[PDB]
Each structure stands twice: as structure tokens, then as C-alpha cells.
Symmetry: D2
Subunit: 461 residues, 4 copies
């Protein structure tokens, strides 16, 4: 036994499952706003010998030896991270060791806050992420709701926008110490300047969680949150088209010096670094760190800006093709990579639409809309451009995807009229032959349309 | 841009750094007790398209769709996990989504304990891990000591073993809600039955964190902590030789003045803590790679593997004893050796830097006696990594020979030098010293390069 | 040495200070809304041998013996407490062991909440008490702000009322577990029904802190908070005219039983009692408990309702006599025992008015007003009726007190024009002979007017 | 209604209950170690018009006016406080606003510690007070164990003394921020110098809670904890014989690689914790009464008083030893005696109920050995109360005689009875037993009524 046997040679059971997952990715139209297809160059570094190296600590401040090579790889990842987002290495540092986006956020809170210090983020049904302090009326859901006291700021139900006025009012009372400016389901751009005004007033840290829009920020196709934020966390994947990892950007240098004359310095670096390790994480995923450095240099290139520009064009094309077919969009449309469709004005919900679209090899996700009246049957979908755009989808290709969706939406509408509760709805798509065959037809037309496009990564897995 | 280019063609700067580390691993004698060389079969799954699938939730309970295949992958991983440790699915469940061992431990505390509830683990300088609640005398270090109140238990320095009696004494007073039985630097078997008795008395959950020995447990070459622990966490790398991920095993079934059978309530709380509480979408590429490794751990090859890991560390132990070195607790019953170099006149900090310069990677270790602040006078040496490279007993005796030459080099430098930075700068500047190091480095790298190396050929 | 020597015989130094304090109380016009003059019957029980008895525990559940007599006294105090506020002993229990009002409030939080559970009270500058969770933008002030997470609800600056609409909005976001309905400086009555609506919606406990208005509630001259509140704490003194102690009223019996049929019972009693002892307090002040039982039976009598009716008449008389002399009142006037005067529309502040009135033997307190612009110089006074009303002051006597105040207010106005900062203002009243003698004149006329009225308690101390 | 009526005329129901307790105190042998009989001079101030003054804040820093006189009263109280304990105002301040001893201790923790910071005190069954962080095995009992994390230290049951060595061992592991040196049921002197050494090592504040012995310390008849403690709290009653209030003494001055003298930062934090943090307006009537008592404690009368308190408890100790009773730690060096009745065949719960029925008030006490849940087999007997009634050595020997008759009565009932409620019901129902109790009660009450009683004549 050498450990050099191939995967297809030594574990055929796992090899098939790998192929069937690649086949499902190829034959399907992935429209999840957070998903993307990773480059082969990054996947070759993700499954590399860097997995074997334990390198606890930081470059030049590690606690083992033998880290001579992973030091260069992390600092290359740090330099590629600052270059990708056009940051001055004198004003910004970046930690590239977080295991994912969730650990990146929790590291920031641990770094800058004490347990039960106060946190403000967009509520999850309104478009905020779990790690922004999601707490329901019955349960503390996220660990950020347990180890810290969080109060959500809400959308304006009449506009679909963040209610920046209500947030300013409720922040003067809640007196938070950190406010997250970041979304998981919000089709418009965040007024980071208005967020900094609120944070500057209530003396709170302004954290920007550009996880969903990191690639669009790097390509300079939307306003960058670094002009206003003190801390910026992001997800390595999603729009950046990398492996699964996380980043924490922090201001460094001089914050302010009335009468003193001595520059009051930024104190984020040592706190952020200590929270990531040794506080929260163990050994860094060096194979991830190298895979994201691969993807970060890809984001510095002229290729990547043309890719992000197509994502906004495709999102805009998806927006108009849905509006011009009888669908409403919350906030009216989009300014980024995603669309938030309202399907109450169509007669369907998000849950049954997700199930009927999943059965035709179209992957979306339900999303709470402002005008909802329940949570098991939300009235909207969330559709993302970046996934199919990496398959060289263009505007006219996304309008054809919308034609495939409204086809399935109408099958669900017809099935909803014959059913009532959701479980017998889902049970209907599995037994009724007329609905079963009509689903298999739409899926076969969808799989045919999808397989023709290229797919990043390897050929077979 | 097709996204299908080679790494060598797309990014040659990074592809060169990949081959630089591949050579550093092939040419070095890797003695870090927690490091292993992952197989190629697992790495192929690790760097696969599964990185693309967002499968938040659990098999059959996802929050999007399209998780058709990865549901089968996560379920295959759970089944291979229970199979590798001889567990009955009716009595044991397992969560395979922890990103690493540290998130695995933080998940258990979040699942079973309230903020500031009390935790007890082996102190870090005494051999415990950070995530066991390590607190300094001046600062809360691990987040386990921030969100939970930790009090450590200690080694008996006379014997180098866990003072199970002082643990019993202090747990009665501290009244912890959870006690951790698991070590990062400990050469002996942990009395899990004694831990369970202590936990039963103060009504505490017994968490066995078997990250360093999970492979030995899987091969059934050392006693299994599953016969005594309520919760078991492990890293999927180290002795398990998988990709970097984490596992949380938990009890299912019955935990019986009414004839009422009280059930186990771990599954829902443990799974909810991993997601949605702590993590986000799981790394399905890592899950699939550790499923490749867990399949390897159920094979007679892995039992031969772990049997040799024991034989090698015992051979390295006996060799060090023959050359006049002291071992904490006198020897080893598992995969690592704790060397006390204070007798031979050298500390661990100096020995670590000299051995690093000759491609012998180890880490310093505080010995029972000298406290945390004092420069550690010991080293922690591990067998698993080189054993994966088909090392045998006489090969580790050669590694001990190389270590001896390195130590005696460090001794002559210490005789020529004063402070530690003077020592570290003398190793790079002194012409004779840097030459005798270059010689030993060459003899080490030639010896190390001859052995096979799991993984790919070039990266 | 027997310990039976009189105080005047054994400690003349302390005896004089006792007399000079009684003389200061007699010669002065006490207008502090929280102060009152205690009956001699209660002071005889306050300084009784009950101080000597340690009786940790509760009647029938004590941990020493020899508590046969203090058991009857506490239950008499419990029965007199339920009778004074017209409560059914089947629906309400009362703990009479709290040392004061602050410990009574902290006992309720400890009983019903975990550390860092969420609390909502009126902000201190808006009229709420310290123990309702007062936290500033710089410091956690009250222990209720430290051991629990509190967010204040505010007044409406345009009306002077509690902004019940903003409170309902911010409670849906803050998700509190307890809301305090109680004030220390609020001239109108609290909509306890609207408070119960908010608490019933966000699933929070409704605590009523009638400390300032307990005597008015007992005399049934204002709406009682027991019709809506789950927990009611109060101060033994203030309007109830007792010694210094505290009470905690809690619902007991049956709270609700859909489908169950088994009555879901109230669970406050064992929790409230355990928090007071053994959690928070040590041995009960049995000499206080007996003094408040004395004062609680006085509150059941027809005498006491005529006393409380005069307090509202005197507060109303003080309100109109100030309005009809050029003073503004926040909320316009009063419906209880206190008046909240606005002295920005007069040219003075609350701090310099408190100092000039203190120098004429008139005791008041500064109070933040809605239209303020600082905190060292608040723009208002808080004047209370219950103190002088216990001296048999009537409406025409309170209008004469207002004439004495506006006299001093105009001396401060004249001194403010000659000064600038507050410290040289206060320094001016001490040196300048023209202002010094004019102050001594107004004080002598005030001391003459005050000494003529009767004074409850003893003659000399 | 003038509000100047007598209590007898205004409320005869309550005035009768006042005289019922006055008689119960005059006729009973008060042996509760924490109870004393307050002088009339203090009670006159206790039930004075100072109950009317709301003086929130501190002398010179009030938040209303009219505090002209009570500022002098609170300042006179602070000066008499420092004088009674031989303290230098340059090295010691004092807060006199604590409502009782329990609020006094909660103030110190709030002043110096963050929520969930670590506290160490003597365990409650071992002699520590509730406010030292008492936690059960099933429930957080004292609020000190809710808002702060407490770990207790224990008696050495072999000697009945504080195990200062196990304290040192466990404080190194638990790392408390504050340690409490103070007892509610402990017959021996606390080694404050050893506590200070432990506190200096783990960098902890030493709080001496001298509620039970403050009078002995004031009379300088036992060593003063002010020579070793950072913070000192006390009740103003118990041995100080004042009205029920509390005191917090704290260090002022200097607490000296730069020639920098680090100052003490207790005054502002301690005062801010008492108000505005925890309390509201102070009870100026209680403050004035404890100022009356502190003046009494500076007199040669109080030194004679406390000297007799020691002599009386030693006489009660020697008497109990002569009759064959066991004493925890073998005797007493202060004001109380811990009797072990497990040898004589009776528990403390039974002895407490029998002695209560014959007007001998004491409280049961858990002995070193039997745990908290077991019915306590001991009693805590105190000297201060009866010593204030001019008891002398031969008088306490008579009290021991009465206790012996009571115990032997309880033994015969235990021989006639099974469970504890059967024991308690037998004492009221059995005709002969209830008669022999009535006889002993009469002989006790006649003996007790003859002695003078501090306070008023009738109430
Ligand atoms: N805008 C926005 N869009 C998306 C899309 C995906 N995600 C990622 C989080 C997905 C997620 C999973 C589980 C829960 C959850 O609560 N589960 C509990 C319920 C128990 C209860 O609530 O009582 C359970 O079923 O176990 C949740 F709330 C959210 C987000 C996001 O975070 N934000
Ligand atoms: N037995 C055992 N062996 C090993 C070998 C590797 N590890 C895993 C991490 C090793 C480790 C330990 C301490 C610190 C630490 O204290 N760091 C702070 C100092 C702050 C302060 O003290 O003020 C710093 O960054 O300097 C650390 F950063 C990293 C372990 C383990 O966990 N246990
Ligand atoms: N409506 C209403 N009226 C009244 C009238 C009296 N009281 C009773 C409380 C009096 C009070 C004392 C001290 C502070 C206070 O903060 N002090 C700190 C400042 C440090 C800081 O704030 O940074 C300091 O000087 O030490 C305070 F805020 C309030 C109330 C009430 O509670 N409510
Ligand atoms: N040495 C020493 N002697 C004395 C003598 C008097 N005291 C002062 C208070 C005595 C005390 C002790 C324990 C509990 C107690 O536990 N109560 C809970 C049970 C809850 C549970 O255990 O679940 C209940 O109400 O039953 C208590 F209520 C009161 C002390 C002291 O503090 N120390
Ligand atoms: C290595 C280890 C961990 C953490 O594993 P990471 O991958 O570094 O997070 C936890 N516990 C023990 C005993 C370990 O050895
Ligand atoms: C996707 C996302 C994250 C990261 O989630 P992970 O699955 O842990 O990587 C964090 N914040 C936001 C706003 C996100 O959309
Ligand atoms: C009696 C006592 C207390 C508390 O005094 P209280 O008046 O009951 O609050 C605190 N500590 C000790 C050691 C005590 O003996
Ligand atoms: C006066 C008051 C209290 C009690 O304060 P204490 O001085 O501790 O008695 C409590 N709540 C309110 C609203 C008060 O006005």
C-alpha cells in the first residue's frame, strides 16, 4: 500500500458518486445565488499535499518548524487578496485562515466583542445571513445569537429596501457595538455610507459581509464597501469563484489625534488574528488557502471583470424576462448578481416552486418576501446569475432559463389547484403520470439545454 | 476562459509553490505527531467538484434542493464512520460536517452547554489541546475559555500520567458539566473507565477527543473510548490519514422508580449546533475525502498500518532510551514519544530549530515540572507520518541516530552562545556550524527521499 | 452597662444631629416627590426589638427556631398588604422582605430571568428609575444594566407622554422578557392596558413599579396596575408613608388550558421568594417589616383616602399655580402626585434652581426635560405633593409655596444674569451680600411658614 | 390625623405583637451565634425621622439637596467606623450605606468583578456564608453563584479547620479573581496571612467578611483581618451589637521597573457599586444607629464585653466537653461553639426542635463528615447575645446544664419514635413528653428573665 492508487481504482463506490455529482452539475441549471463552479487550477490546489502540513500560527510567528513553503503561500494569498480588492497594504491587512464564511464572521465578533456584547444585522427572512445574529421568537438559532446579544434591523415592507431610518432609530436605543452590512438575499446595493453614519454615531464597528458580492466588488462593477467599513469579511467562493474558505479584511495603520499629536492607531490586526487562532480555529486548511490564492489572482485579471459584468447583465436579463412574463420582483428589480422574485402575485409559493423546479434539474431556493403571511410556504424564489454565467451563459441564454422556470411554475400552479397541503402537492409530482411525464419532459429539455455549455473544473469529477 | 486549465499553465507561481512543499515533505523526516500523509484517493475527492455544492442542512433535511448525490455521499460517510469504529448505528450517530477538530469541539460545547457552563480538560502544557478550554494565567486564550468556564486537570509530574485522583477531587468542587478525555501530547493510554466514573459522580458528560489516536482506535490496536464516552470527537486527519475535517460521534438509544427508559438527547442538539448554529454549508469535498479515508481504515491494511505505528514509536522510544534520553512517563503505549532533553543539557526550543534546519520537523514540548513560561525542555515526536511512508523499526532507529547528531550539534552551539536569539542566529551565520548542519541535512534528505510518499507524484 | 441608657444620655453628639435633622425637616418645605414623613406608630416599630431577631426563611419555612412571633408579624404584613391594595389572597401573594425598592426590583429579575436576559424600561432622563436598566452611552450604570441586557423605551418629545407606539415597535425587535411599567418622574398615568398588550404580544412579563404612586393606588384614587400586571413591586415609603422597605406582589393561582383541561398554574411565588432569600438577601429586617405593616393598615383606613385625594388636589393646585405664573409643565400638567416643571421657558435651569431653592429651605430635585440640550444643566424641577400634604397642607398652602419658589427662581434668574458657569453661580449665592441677605430673607419667611404646620413622627427626633 | 399617635393607641394589634417578641427575647436563652441585643441608644436612632431623608449619593456628592445634616451623620459614621477598628483614614475608607451584610458582599463583587468572574469562599456546610457563592449540587442558590462563578474551599474534616493547603492547590487551578476569608459557623481563627499569600500568588483580591467577629476585632481581642485584607465587609449587628446594616472597608493609598507607585482603585469602584449600581437611597436611620453602636465599640465597656464573650464561649465549650460532647475542631477561640451530637446519639435537627420548645434558641449545623443532604448532627451555639445580658462563665455552665436536659429528652423521644416528623409530632402530643418539656421551659424562662436586657422596657 503506497497511497498513490487512484480514486477510481481503489474506491469505485466513491468514484461513481463523484461522477454522478459532476453529471448532476452539468445537466442542471444551477441558479442558487451562493453556488458557483470552481476553476480546475484551484481544485488542483485544493486536493494537494498542502493538506498534510500543520502550520498553526502565522507567517514568521508559527509554533512548529518546517513551514517555509506554506509561509510563502499564505503571504501570497494575503498579497493576492489585497491586490484583488485594490487595497493599500499600509491601510488593510487580511487573514486568510478562516475555514468558511461563518467562521470568519464568528472570529470577528470574538476579536472585537466580549460575550453578550450587542450586535445588529439584517434579519434572516429580510435578507441577512444566519451569522448576523439570527434569533427567532422561540429559539436562539445562530451561535452569534447565543454568545452575543443581537437585534435585527428590518426591511421597509413598502419598498423592499433596508429601512436605514428605522435602523438609525433602533441603534440609538440598542447601542450596539457592531453592525453587519451584508446580505444573503438582497437584490439592491447597500448604502455603506449611511451605515458608516449610523456606526459613527452610536460608536459601533461597521462590519461589511460582502460574501455574496465579493466577486462584483473585486471587478469594480459595484461600489466597494472598503471605502466605509472598518472590518470586511467575505466568503472565498460564491462570486469569487474559489474553493470553500473565508477572509477577514481589517483596517490597519492610523485611525485618528486631537491635542495628543501621537497617532491613535488601528488595533484590529492583533485582535482579529488572535481570534482566528488560537481562539477559534486549529490548524489552517493550507490546501484551501492555496486554492483561494489561485482564485484570487484569477479575480485580478481582465477576464474576471468581463465575467462579473456578464453576471449583472444576466441578472438584469433574468429580472426583465421575469417582469415581462408576469412576475413581480421585490424592490422592483436588481443591481447585483441575484433576483428576488415575488410569486404571491402569481398564485404559487416558494416551497412548491422549489420542489417542481428541483425535479426539472433547476436548483433554486425559497425566500421570505416582505408581503408574506407564513414561513413554511414563503412567497418567493431566490435566483442567482454567477453559477450559470461561469458556464458562459449570456443574456439570451438566461431568458431561455426563465422560459423553463415559468413552464415549471405553471405545472406547479396546475398541480396546486388539484392539491391543497404541501405534502400531497409534493406527493402528486411523484405518482400522477400526467404530471410525472410532463415533468420528465421539461427536465429532459432542461438537461439538453444545460449539457451543451462548458463546465469549469475537471472533466469527470 | 474555460476554467479547465491546468494549475501549471494557469498559475505557475502557485504551481511552483505546490512542488516546493511536495519536495519539502518528500525530503524531510516528518516527526510532528499530528501530521500524516494523505492518500491520493482522498485528495482526488478533496479537490473535486463537490466544492461547488451548497448542501446546508442534513441528508433528507436540506434547505435547498439538488442535494441528490451529496446526500448519498454524506450518508455513505456516516456509515463508513460507524463501520470504521465498530459502532452500532442503533447506539451511535455521527456528524461529518465539522470543518476541523476545533469546530468539532466547539460544536459539542454549544450543543450540550450554556454560555459560561463549566468545562474540564487536560491543561495545555500538560498535554491537552487548546479547545479543551486552555486559559493562560494572564489571558483567555481558546474560545472554549471565553464562552465557557474552564478549569484544567493536571499530570502527576512524578509519573508523567494524568492525576485521575486530583481530577476526581477537583471535579467534585468545580462541578463541571462536561469533562474532556483527550490529549495532544501524551504517550500513554487514557483510563476512560476512570473518567466515566468521575463524570457519573458529578453528573457530567464525558467527551472523548480522540484526534491523535483515532486511527489506532479504528484499527482496534488500542482500547476504544467508545466503550465509555458519551460524545466522541476526532479529526479526520492525523492518525486517520484523511483530509482535514472533523467528526462528532454521539450516543443514540437509552440513557432506566417508574420503569421509564430515559432516552439519549444528543442527536438533535449536536446536529443543530454544527448547523445552523455554528457552521454554514458543509465542505462536501472534505466529507467525501474523509469517506475515502474511512473506507481505508476498515481494511486489514490499516490495521497493519496502525500496528506498525505502535511498533515504530516503541522502537523510537527504545532507541532514545539507549542513547541516554529521558522519556516523559518512561516510554509510550501509542503513537508518539515525549522526550525530555533537560538531562542532556538542551531545551526543546533549541533542539526544534536545529532539527528543522536539517529537515527533521518536530515541535517543542513542555515537560512535567518546568512551567509554561519557561522555555520547554522537551520534544514531541510522532510515528504516523513516516510509518505511512513504509518506515519500519530499524528506520526509526536511524531517525533517532539523526536526532542524536542534531542534538549534539545544538549542544556545542549552546556552549558557544548565550541567549536564544544568539543561538538561532549562530546556526545561520557560523561558517563551520552552518556547514555541519548542511551535511546532516543532506544525509537526512537522501535517507528520506528513498521512501515512498502517499499522494500525487508532483504536488 | 445595660444598653438601656437613652440616646440623649449616652451619645449627645448623635442626639444633636438627630434634633437638627428634625428641625431641618420641620423648618423646610420638602417637595421631593419620593420623600414623605413617617407616622410615629411606624417609627416606634422601626426602632423596636424586632431588629434583634434573625429569621431567615419564610413563615413556616424558616431555618432557625424561635420565630413564633415574627411569623405572625410577617403574615400580618402580608395580609395587610393584600388588603391595602384590595387583592384576593387566592390571586395575589406578596413578599414583604425586600430591604428597599431597588432590592425588590433586582429580586424580580433574578427570579424570572437568567443573566443577560432582556429588559425594557423607561429611560432615566425620560422618567424611569435606575433599577429599570439605566445604561448610558459610556457606562453600565445600574446593576440591572450589568446582570441583564436592557434597552430603554422613550418619551414622545412632542407630548411628554410615553411613546407606546415606539415601545411596541422596538419590543418586537428587542424581544424582551420583562417590561417595567413604572416611573420616578412622570406626571401622567401609565396605560397599563397598552403595556399588557405589548407584553402579551412579545411574550414578556409585565412588571409594574408603582413605587412613586403606591399610596394613590391603595386609596383607589388612580387606576390600579394590578388589573393588568403579572408582577408589581413597590417602595414601602414615598406615597404609602411608611418606613424604608420593599414589596413584591405576584400573581398566584391559574394562568390559563387549551385541550389539556389541567390548569396551567402561575409559577411566580416560589421563584420570587427564592430570589429574595436565599438568592439575594440575608436576614429580613423584621423591624422594617413591622413598621410597614403599621403603615399598611393606615393605608386601609378612610383617613388615608382623604390624604391621597388631597395629594392630587395639591399637585393640581401646584400645577395651575405654576402655569398661571409663567411656567410650562411637561405633558401640560399632572394626573398624580408630582409636577414636572419646564424652566427653559423661564430662562433658568434645574441645577441652579435646585441650589437657590435649597438655600431657602425648599428641597427639590433637577429633572431632565424632553426639550433639553445638556445633562449638567437640566431644564426642569420635580416637585412632589405627598411630603407637605402629610403636614396637613391644603390647596391654598401649596399656592403659597409656589409663590416662594418663583421668588427664589427670580433671584436665581438675577444671579444667572450676573454670572455664567454654574460654579460661579453657586459661589455667588455664598459671597455677594445683596444676594446673600435676600436669600436669608426668603428662607426666614419660608421657615416661618413651614414650622406652623404639624409634623408626623416624634416631637424631638 | 397628626401622625404623632403612640403605636399602642394607633395600632394595638401590632403593638401587642411587639411585646410578644420582647417577652420571647427576655424569657429565652438566645444562643443563635449571629444574634445580639441592640442597645436602646441605637434603636432610638433606628426608629427616628432619618427614615424620611432621601440622601442618594454620598457626603458632598448628593443628587438632591437638604442633605445638610445627614451628610454630617454619614461622615460621623465613617469616622467612628475607622476609629472602632484602629484604621488610618489615609489607608482605609469605608462605605456605610449597605443595607445588610448580603448587599455588602454583592457590592464588592459588582465593584471589582465582571459578571461570571471567579469567586472562592468557604463552602456553606463547611462554615461559609451564602453570599460566599454557595452553589448546591443541583441548583445555583446564592445570587453570588448566579452572577459570578464560585468554587468553594473546604474544611479538613480530620481537624475541623480550613484546609489552607487544598485552597492553595485549587486556587492555582480555578484562578479566582477574589477569595473570601470569612465564616458563619467556624470556632477558630482564620489565618489571614495564609489567605493573603494565596491571593498574592493567583493575583486575587482578599475579601475578609468579618460579620461574625467584627466586635471581637473592634475590641482587639482577636487578630484584626485589616492587617492582611484588601477589602473588609461586615454586618453592623451580630457581635458589633448595632442595628442591621452593612459596612465595606477598603484600602486607600499605594498598592511600587520605573519607580511608579501604583495606587489603590477601590474607593470609586466600591462606592459606585453600592450606589447608583445596586442600592437606592440609603437608610439614614440605620446609618445613624450603627454610628451609635460604633461609638459604643470604641469604649472600654465593649472590650470588657468582647473579652467576656470569649470567656463565655470557652466556658460553654469546657462545660460541653465535661458532659461528654464533641466539639468541631476540639473547642473555640472566638465567640461560638460547634457541637457534634452524633456521638451522643442525636442529630442537630432534633436537638434544635427540642431546645426551641424549651426557649433555648439555637440552629443545627452540618458537621465535617456528613454531607449537606444528611440531617445535620451538630449545633452552632453563640455567646454574644446572652453576654450582652450580663451573663458570666457560671451562667453559661448553667445554660449547658439546660442543654443537656434538653438533649436527653430528645434522646428518649428518638428511642420512642421513628422518622423526623414523628419526632416533631411526638413533642407536642405525648402527654408526659410535653409536660417534661413545659417543666424545662419554665426553669429556663425563669433563669433567663432575671438577667437585664438591652433596649426598651416594653418593646
Ligand atoms: N436571507 C438568507 N437566505 C438564505 C438562504 C440560505 N441561507 C443559509 C441559512 C439557511 C437556514 C437553515 C436553517 C434555519 C433554521 O432556522 N432551522 C431550524 C428551524 C428551527 C426554528 O427556527 O425554530 C430547523 O429546522 O432545525 C434557518 F433559519 C436558515 C440563508 C440566509 O442565511 N439568509
Ligand atoms: N499539548 C499540546 N500540544 C500542541 C502542539 C500544537 N498544539 C496546537 C496549538 C499550540 C499552541 C499553544 C499555545 C498557544 C498560545 O498560548 N499562544 C499565544 C500566547 C498568549 C498568551 O499566553 O498570552 C500567542 O500567540 O503567543 C498557541 F498560540 C498555540 C498543541 C496543543 O494544543 N496542545
Ligand atoms: N426619572 C428619575 N428621577 C430620579 C431622581 C432620583 N433618582 C434616583 C437616581 C439618581 C441618580 C444618581 C446617579 C446617577 C449617575 O449616573 N451617576 C454617575 C454618573 C456617571 C455616568 O453617567 O457616566 C456618577 O456621577 O457617579 C443617575 F443617573 C441617577 C431618579 C431616577 O432614577 N429617575
Ligand atoms: N455556615 C452557615 N450557617 C448559617 C446559618 C444561617 N445561615 C444563613 C442562611 C442559611 C441557609 C443555608 C442553605 C439554604 C438552602 O440551601 N435553601 C434552599 C435549598 C435549595 C436546594 O438545595 O435545592 C431552600 O429554600 O430549601 C438556605 F435557604 C439558608 C448560614 C450560612 O449561610 N452559613
Ligand atoms: C489537532 C487536535 C484538535 C484540532 O484539530 P484541528 O484540525 O487543528 O482543528 C483538537 N483536539 C485534539 C486532541 C487535537 O490533537
Ligand atoms: C454564504 C455566506 C456566508 C458563508 O457561509 P458558509 O457556508 O459558512 O461559507 C457568510 N455570510 C454571508 C452573508 C453569506 O451569504
Ligand atoms: C450574617 C452574615 C452575612 C449577611 O448578613 P445579613 O444581614 O443577613 O445580610 C454575610 N456574611 C456573613 C459571614 C454573615 O455571618
Ligand atoms: C424610589 C423608587 C424605587 C426605590 O428606591 P430605593 O431608594 O432603593 O428604595 C424603586 N423604583 C422606583 C420607580 C422608585 O421611584
Amino acid at each position: 500500500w503506497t497511497g498513490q492508487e487512484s480514486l477510481s481504482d481503489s474506491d469505485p463506490e466513491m468514484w461513481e458518486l463523484l461522477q454522478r455529482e459532476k453529471d448532476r452539475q452539468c445537466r442542471g441549471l444551477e441558479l442558487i445565488a451562493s453556488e458557483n463552479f470552481c476553476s480546475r487550477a484551484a481544485l488542483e490546489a485544493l486536493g494537494s499535499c498542502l493538506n498534510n502540513k500543520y502550520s498553526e500560527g502565522y507567517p514568521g510567528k508559527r509554533f512548529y518548524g518546517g513551514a517555509e513553503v506554506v509561509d510563502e503561500i499564505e503571504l501570497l494569498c494575503q498579497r493576492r487578496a489585497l491586490e484583488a480588492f485594490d487595497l493599500d497594504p499600509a491601510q488593510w491587512g487580511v487573514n486568510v485562515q478562516p475555514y468558511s464564511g461563518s467562521p470568519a464572521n464568528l472570529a470577528v465578533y470574538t476579536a472585537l466583542l466580549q460575550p453578550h456584547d450587542r450586535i445588529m444585522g439584517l434579519d434572516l427572512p429580510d435578507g441577512g445571513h444566519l451569522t448576523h445574529g439570527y434569533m427567532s421568537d422561540v429559539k436562539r438559532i445562530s451561535a452569534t445569537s447565543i454568545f452575543f446579544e443581537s437585534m435585527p434591523y428590518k426591511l421597509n415592507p413598502k419598498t423592499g429596501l433596508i429601512d436605514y431610518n428605522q435602523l438609525a432609530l433602533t441603534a440609538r436605543l440598542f447601542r450596539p457595538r457592531l453592525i453587519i452590512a451584508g446580505t444573503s438575499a438582497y437584490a439592491r446595493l447597500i448604502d455603506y455610507a449611511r451605515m458608516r453614519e449610523v456606526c459613527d454615531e452610536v460608536k459601533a464597528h461597521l462590519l461589511a459581509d460582502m460574501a455574496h458580492i465579493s466577486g462584483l466588488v473585486a471587478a469594480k462593477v459595484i461600489p466597494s464597501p472598503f471605502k466605509h467599513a472598518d472590518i470586511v469579511t467575505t466568503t472565498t467562493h460564491k462570486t469569487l469563484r474559489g474553493a470553500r474558505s473565508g477572509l477577514i479584511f481589517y483596517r490597519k495603520g492610523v485611525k485618528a489625534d486631537p491635542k495628543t499629536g501621537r497617532e491613535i492607531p488601528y488595533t484590529f490586526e492583533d485582535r482579529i488574528n488572535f481570534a482566528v487562532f488560537p481562539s477559534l480555529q486549529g490548524g489552517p486548511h493550507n490546501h484551501a488557502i492555496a486554492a483561494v490564492a489561485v482564485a484570487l489572482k484569477q479575480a485580478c485579471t481582465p477576464m474576471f471583470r468581463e465575467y462579473s459584468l456578464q453576471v449583472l447583465k444576466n441578472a438584469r436579463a433574468m429580472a426583465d424576462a421575469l417582469l415581462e412574463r408576469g412576475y413581480s420582483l421585490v424592490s422592483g428589480g436588481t443591481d447585483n448578481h441575484l433576483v428576488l422574485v415575488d410569486l404571491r402575485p402569481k398564485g404559487l409559493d416558494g416551497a412548491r416552486a422549489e420542489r417542481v423546479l428541483e425535479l426539472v434539474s433547476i436548483t433554486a431556493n425559497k425566500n421570505t418576501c416582505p408581503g408574506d403571511r407564513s414561513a413554511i410556504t414563503p412567497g418567493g424564489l431566490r435566483l442567482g446569475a454567477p453559477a450559470l454565467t461561469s458556464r458562459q451563459f449570456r443574456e439570451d441564454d438566461f431568458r431561455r432559463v426563465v422560459d423553463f422556470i415559468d413552464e415549471g411554475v405553471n405545472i406547479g400552479l396546475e398541480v396546486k389547484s388539484k392539491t391543497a397541503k404541501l405534502q400531497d402537492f409534493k406527493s402528486f409530482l411523484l405518482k400522477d403520470s400526467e404530471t410525472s411525464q410532463r415533468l420528465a419532459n421539461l427536465r429532459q429539455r432542461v438537461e439538453q439545454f444545460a449539457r451543451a455549455f462548458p463546465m469549469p473544473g475537471f472533466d469527470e469529477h
